[PDB]
């Protein structure tokens, strides 16, 4: 039921947990906002997360951890997100994989969450979450040939965008596609 990813991204020290949550919440508010409210693009949020991830400043790491932990723990609610926000979420989730902001257990989990989304009905919101996330990290697929085999085995793989079919099939062979 409730997932708990605190072993990857520890909970903040109690002393400033309120402020860390509020800061994380603010970044998400901005990634989902529309003008005239303040916004941040997915690329801007990714740039910040890259700086924070292994920052020597505890507060920055704590906000990174809070954002990633909450994002991943939100997966079971993604189907409840409006289409606009779900798409932004997909781009962010795929970008996190693309930029190597998750490794080991969390990378495997991220890949699994994308794969499970792609298995949802063709044309569904979660299918499109999967496609958008996958397009962000497609240049990494050749490093995960068994993952590519699993993608190719999806019952509606033949309906994926052409370029993604190429990246996946060549990725099964640990290769780039013929053009990127």
């Amino acid at each position: 039921q409730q997932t708990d990813l605190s072993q990857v991204w520890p909970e903040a020290n109690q002393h400033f947990s309120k402020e860390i949550d509020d800061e994380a919440n603010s970044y998400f508010q901005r990634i989902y906002n529309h003008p005239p409210h303040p916004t941040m693009s997915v690329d801007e949020v990714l740039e910040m997360l890259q700086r924070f991830k292994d920052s020597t400043i505890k507060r920055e790491r704590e906000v990174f951890n809070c954002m990633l932990r909450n994002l991943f723990e939100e997966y079971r609610f993604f189907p409840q997100y409006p289409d606009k926000e779900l798409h932004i979420t997909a781009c962010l989730f795929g970008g996190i994989i693309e930029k190597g902001l998750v490794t080991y257990m969390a990378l495997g989990l991220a890949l699994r969450y994308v794969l499970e989304a792609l298995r949802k009905p063709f044309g569904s919101k979660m299918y499109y979450f999967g496609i958008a996330a996958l397009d962000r990290f497609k240049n990494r697929l050749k490093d995960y040939p068994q993952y590519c085999q699993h993608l190719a085995s999806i019952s509606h793989f033949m309906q994926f965008p052409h370029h993604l079919q190429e990246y996946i099939e060549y990725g099964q062979q640990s290769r780039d596609p013929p053009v990127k």
Binding site: D21, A24, N25, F28, Q29, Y32, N70, E73, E74, F77, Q80, Y81, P82, E85
Partner: peptide, 12 residues
Amino acid sequence: RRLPIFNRISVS
């Protein structure tokens, strides 16, 4: 443990 922003956008 959800952040308010996610409670807000979620249609439950």
